[PDB]
Amino acid sequence: AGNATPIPGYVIQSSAQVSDDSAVSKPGFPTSGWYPVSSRSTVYAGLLQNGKYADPFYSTNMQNVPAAQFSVPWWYRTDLNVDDTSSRTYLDFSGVLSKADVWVNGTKVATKDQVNGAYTRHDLDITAQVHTGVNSVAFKVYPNDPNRDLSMGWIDWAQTPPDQNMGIVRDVLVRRSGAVALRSAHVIQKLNSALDHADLTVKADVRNDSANAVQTTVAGTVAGKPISQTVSLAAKERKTVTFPLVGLDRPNVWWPAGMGGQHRYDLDLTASVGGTPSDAAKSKFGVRDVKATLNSSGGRQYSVNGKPLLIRGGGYTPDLFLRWNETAAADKLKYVLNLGLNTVRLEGHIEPDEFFDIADDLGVLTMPGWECCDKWEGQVNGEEKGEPWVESDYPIAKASMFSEAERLRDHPSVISFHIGSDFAPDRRIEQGYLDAMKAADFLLPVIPAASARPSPITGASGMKMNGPYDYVPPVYWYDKSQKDRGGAWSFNSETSAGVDIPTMDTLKRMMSASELDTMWKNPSAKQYHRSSSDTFGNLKLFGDALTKRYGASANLNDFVRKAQLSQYENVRAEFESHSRNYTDSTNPSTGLIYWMLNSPWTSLHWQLFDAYMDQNGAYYGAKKANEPLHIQYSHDNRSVVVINQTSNAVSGLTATTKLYNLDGTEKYSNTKTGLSVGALGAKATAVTVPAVSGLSTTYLAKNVLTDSSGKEVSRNVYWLSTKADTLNWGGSDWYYTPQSAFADLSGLNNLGQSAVGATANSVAGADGTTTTTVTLKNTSGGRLPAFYVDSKVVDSAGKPVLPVEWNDNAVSLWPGETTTLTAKYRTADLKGSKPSVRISGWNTGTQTVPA
Ligand SMILES: N[C@H]1CN2CC[C@H](O)[C@@H]2[C@@H](O)[C@@H]1O
């Protein structure tokens, strides 16, 4: 008694092949030719699992899937054994897209009118229907239409999954307990402002589902303190048990990564009846305080544990077909940290519990909320996809808020819930959301929208969604003059410069030779792996600025090499600008969510890391920007700026800024010593680079930060032009601002050959990981830097070992200079091969060294 076991898997088939719905869940039902699938599968995932269609990640494979078959229901069916019918039996689940009939042993226990909406939780007492031995359960899962159903959809991020994700994407728990069922155990936690004392209020529901009145004792531990309450329950009665306040002295406060540890406490409760355990629940919570208030400029400002914070993050997405794997979730979040980011946004598609656990454990902050552009906003978004709400929609959306509030309330990573995205909810829908949260004791900041749209009750959003979402040059980010644009000011909830060409290794796995030929030759042509949206269907704006700024592409390799430079440069400036302006007295930047962190699939835009966890110019660019102790060059005013992200003020820093023509001639040098800079996003200005006579059209700026012990702590190399990027502001659309003039960076085409310079070694650790160390030296006999040198852990065939975490990469080294790099990865991902390192540079060619 106190049992909860996930159904491990099902066999599935279309309802096309089922003429008697009641037959499915009778024990002995034949399933010849049904598809075996693991827990958490959409129909199409399940069919991929059985190898029924080709790899959707490659080319247009996904188009060749007949989608008609997903406009009818599919059954999810499994046996369940019950050795003893002393215990009551429950199905507890969520994640049904879009709705389902639930059947046990030939009886319909619930219909799609009740079991409706992806986020709604259901706790079905199936005691009457369960017998000794073999029992069976079947879900008739109805088709998903994200515009019709309070569910999940893909907006314009990728292309539409053939099944629109229908199926059961979270676990179904089979629960067993006595007369009393224990549900919804949480801990309300309140930290004093000094962070040295907390008050914990444990609440938990007991439900008596027996025929007779009972006395139940709910007892156990919170944070290692004993607790006990005894209440009476009438037959069929459910109560909320509030426990007396527990004081917790000098708590182990949960902090964001790099600000402290990520301790979580345990709540462990047993409901007993008649001196015997009836049900039990274990959970965790973190002791932490969060706020998100409007500053004096109307900007939404977050703080954790009293500490103000520039949110620096990206929009997280799951797999396009909602295929779940815990390790991969963890790898994805681990990359957030490798990037130097502190936050991920979840525009809908809110992930299963474990994702929040991992987030908690690693100290990555999360911004979950509902999504735009479909049913969720169908009642306030007018002409945009998403159907106006009917009366039955209201209780489903309210039940969805409650369920999520309940799942999410105790995860310290969560800093807010967005109740709208593009459109704030109206007063009726908003009251529904506030009531649901109140009832779940969900006490986090509620943000009305991610755009500037206010809601009637909560009010101003303190954010903006002004774009861009496609190509803009670096200096665009430094704008504070255009208040309908996406410059570094207020809270940038979702923005990027669009196209993000992945590594050549990802390219070759995701597109044909012909597809790739077209991409570089005709950026204007439609690419299946960008977007279903006509607006983001092609790479025209990107191709156009690429040619203009770096020069026309001679071939695929040329296109890709320049693509990476552009993405690095662009993403770098996007974050750097927001970091700099965070400490403006007037309209500070309070947030940045890059659009996006990752893609749901193999893609050509809106990503820092690709679907295979490979790392390109955009990744390395985000990583440079987000260094904890960082030196940066402002593209607007040519000031060299030091940013300290750490939880401690730093002193005795020197900032060295040097300019070089492409022939290697130093044309400017400045050394600023004894720099202090405060903690947590504060900045300091080293120098403003003056205009310098005699710079080559394309030149380099070498920015170096060294601490008091002389250690180089940040190195930052910019390829700059004597010719400015300038904006045609009045030509701005919602998704970009075109350029009145373009920079000339094409000199890189003729940057002379340098050389490197490489040694490598690997240690297999006892923790299951290998650390490959690589020493790079510029070994040339001249004056030329080894520019943009990318190191890759590869196996013996030269295929990248992924996921991987480097301390630094994409380095530039001047003659004689040396750097030592560290790469870490699971030993098992070598798949038995010895490790090597592939080293390629803009002007140093490609070599691979054993390691
Ligand atoms: N929140 C929305 C806001 N949209 C504005 C432009 C783009 O369609 C973007 C969506 O990707 C995103 O999902």
Short mmCIF file of N, CA and C in Angstrom, two decimals, residues 73 121 187:
data_model
loop_
_atom_site.label_atom_id
_atom_site.label_comp_id
_atom_site.label_asym_id
_atom_site.label_seq_id
_atom_site.Cartn_x
_atom_site.Cartn_y
_atom_site.Cartn_z
N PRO A 73 -8.90 7.88 -34.47
CA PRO A 73 -8.19 7.49 -33.25
C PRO A 73 -7.22 6.31 -33.40
N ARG A 121 -4.50 16.49 -15.65
CA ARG A 121 -4.27 15.29 -14.90
C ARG A 121 -5.58 14.57 -14.56
N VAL A 187 5.00 21.57 -0.34
CA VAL A 187 5.54 22.37 0.76
C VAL A 187 5.57 23.85 0.38
#
